[model samples]
Target: FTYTFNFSLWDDLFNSLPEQFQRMRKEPWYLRRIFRSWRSGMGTSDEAVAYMRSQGLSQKAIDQFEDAYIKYRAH
Candidate 1:
């Protein structure tokens, strides 16, 4: 549940970047890096790590937000 909040902040942080820097092929890695860095800095928990066992979770969790990224990559 808490990771949902993390993504919301990540989502907003990502949106705030300049459009030229928002390329799908690149920014997702940066955002993942940003989120993981934050997670390492007191934002992580054993619970979240354990919850990550299901590989399907990542795909579905980002399902809603990735819609925008889907088309953005079309360029």
Candidate 2:
């Protein structure tokens, strides 16, 4: 029998928003970009993550994706 991991990892990641914000606050540039990118249900977490990865962003830089995603959902 094969067990399925039906859990939505991104959902869990998005749920932990407060922590994301706390980390994001450390980087003003990322924070600014995040808010600027937000626009009435345009961007998505997967897209943002892919873009950041393509840009060769560091772990800290990638964290911004989580930060912005959570904030977007919350708002």
Candidate 3:
């Protein structure tokens, strides 16, 4: 039952982190799960993870976001 297109403030996602932490991992599991919920469909786990990594994000960053990430999508 969790689905919303209203992306919350970009800062909201990082507001809780330290100033030094300007980056975060855009995890594939989240993508696999989140994308399947999307209206269009979903991407394979391999593609999701690989593509996310291709963006130049390190494992450490992904871990940071995965730890602090919340469902604060919208009001």
Candidate 4:
């Protein structure tokens, strides 16, 4: 059998680490997980990592960028 899950957040701030940490850290673990998943997806996507590198973002920077992108999209 196949199963699916649906999740939603009422506030974009739930995806923001500093905001979430100060307000509701325990509730936003999935938001953080989604950010990490996006980074992994970018790493595997067509030339995404290479493009970020060409633009002067180191691996660490790329990871942070993906995280920020997730937060931005969440908003």
Q: Name the candidate that leads on TM-score.
A: 2
Measure candidate 4: CA RMSD: 12.9
In model 1, the runs with Cα more than 4 Å from the true position are 1-26, 43-75
Task: Report every candidate's CA lDDT.
Answer: 0.39, 0.52, 0.39, 0.45
Query: What CA RMSD would you report for each candidate?
Result: 12.7, 11.9, 10.5, 12.9
Which number leads on lDDT? 2
- Candidate 3 stretches with Cα past 4 Å from truth are 1-40, 63-75
| Candidate 4 ranges with C-alpha deviation above 4 Å | 1-47
- Across 1-75, the per-residue lDDT of candidate 2 in tens digits comes to 111112245644553334444344455555555565565558776787777666555555467456545654565
lDDT of 4: 0.45
As for lDDT, the candidate ahead, 2 or 3, is: 2
What TM-score would each prediction reach against the true structure? Answer: 0.26, 0.40, 0.31, 0.35
Record all residue pairs in model 1 with backbone atoms less than 3 Å apart, i.e. clashing. none
Question: What does candidate 4's lDDT look like per residue over 1-75, in tens digits?
Answer: 111112225232333234322222344555456445666675553465576666554455456544555454555
True-structure lDDT of candidate 3: 0.39
**Clashing residue pairs in candidate 4, if any?**
none
lDDT, ranked from best to worst: 2, 4, 3, 1
Residue lDDT tens for model 3, 24-65? 223445534443453245444456446546665455544433
Residues 1-75 of candidate 1: C-alpha lDDT, one tens digit per residue:
111123345554543323422332245665455444544575434444344333233433344334433333342
For model 2 the local lDDT of residue 40 reads 56
Rank order (by TM-score, best first) = 2, 4, 3, 1
